[PDB]
């Protein structure tokens, strides 16, 4: 009954709805539009801060970059306050994951592939874990709002979530590396009501949001069982039919992962 079930959640929520759970040895793939593309949004910075993680060493981690109020051209809670002390990557990699920083994600992307490098730096990363489907072609904050059907600034639910599987599960980061990236989504202030709202308090949730233009919302999540058997839920929706300033619905999110938490019962 999962087709069934998401299904009527397209219906209710007037959203189209993705989800991708990669297969374990106990579990099979949770799979709902997982190969159709959905913009990234926010959900880039995830992968993105890896990507520095891995290109340098934890000494990088200290390295003051220096931006103006200019170039906070987005939604930049952590990045508003440092206009002059700057911020240690390390800091920007944590607005980068805990608070969507967009003004954090685009010195990011330059400390990655240069001024005019950063979005193809970045694809290419995850060209480097096998995601060959997925493409960054923007930056803040244009990422967020290319149109339907547009094929820039898109990754899939499938693809995501076997990139997050080798980042937080896999052996892509280092073991210290990923310690820092584990606890940076296992950090983040803004998926409350989204996977998290949907798996049983018992269950532990570590996970990226992104919000968007054309009702965009995900969110890509590891999860863990009391009995510390992992999964990896990867939910995106947007509401095109709604138009540019179509309302997200977090509480879609919330839904869907709450019928693969069902499931993996
Ligand atoms: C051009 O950029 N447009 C954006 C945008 O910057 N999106 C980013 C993205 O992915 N972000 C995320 C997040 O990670 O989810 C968030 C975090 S979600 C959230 N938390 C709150 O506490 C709250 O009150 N409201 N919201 C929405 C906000 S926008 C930023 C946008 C936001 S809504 C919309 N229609 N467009």
Redesign the pocket.
């Known amino acids: 009954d999962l087709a069934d079930r998401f299904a009527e959640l397209e219906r209710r929520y007037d959203a189209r709805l993705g989800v991708y759970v990669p297969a374990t040895g106990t579990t099979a793939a949770i799979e709902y539009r997982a190969d159709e593309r959905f913009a990234f949004?926010?959900?880039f910075k995830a992968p993105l801060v890896a990507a520095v993680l891995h290109q340098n060493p934890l000494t990088h981690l200290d390295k003051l970059i220096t931006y103006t109020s200019d170039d906070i051209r987005?939604?930049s809670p952590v990045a508003q306050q440092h206009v002059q002390t700057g911020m240690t990557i390390g800091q920007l990699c944590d607005a980068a994951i805990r608070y969507?920083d967009?003004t954090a994600a685009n010195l990011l992307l330059a400390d990655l592939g240069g001024p005019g490098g950063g979005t193809a730096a970045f694809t290419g990363y995850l060209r480097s874990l096998g995601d060959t489907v997925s493409r960054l072609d923007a930056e803040?904050?244009?990422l967020?709002?290319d149109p339907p059907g547009d094929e820039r600034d898109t990754t899939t639910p499938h693809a995501i979530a076997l990139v997050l599987q080798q980042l937080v599960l896999g052996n892509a980061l280092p073991p210290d590396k990923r310690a820092l990236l584990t606890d940076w989504m296992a950090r983040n202030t803004?998926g409350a009501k989204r996977i998290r709202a949907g798996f049983p308090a018992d269950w532990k949730v570590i996970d990226?949001?992104?919000?968007?233009?054309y009702?965009?919302?995900?969110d890509i999540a590891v999860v863990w069982s009391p009995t510390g058997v992992p999964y990896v839920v990867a939910v995106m929706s947007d509401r095109a039919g709604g138009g540019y300033?179509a309302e997200?619905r977090e509480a879609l999110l919330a839904e869907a992962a709450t019928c693969v938490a069902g499931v993996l019962a």
Do not use: H
């Open positions: 949004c926010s959900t987005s939604i969507s967009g803040e904050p244009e967020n709002r803004t990226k949001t992104g919000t968007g233009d009702g965009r919302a995900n300033d997200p």
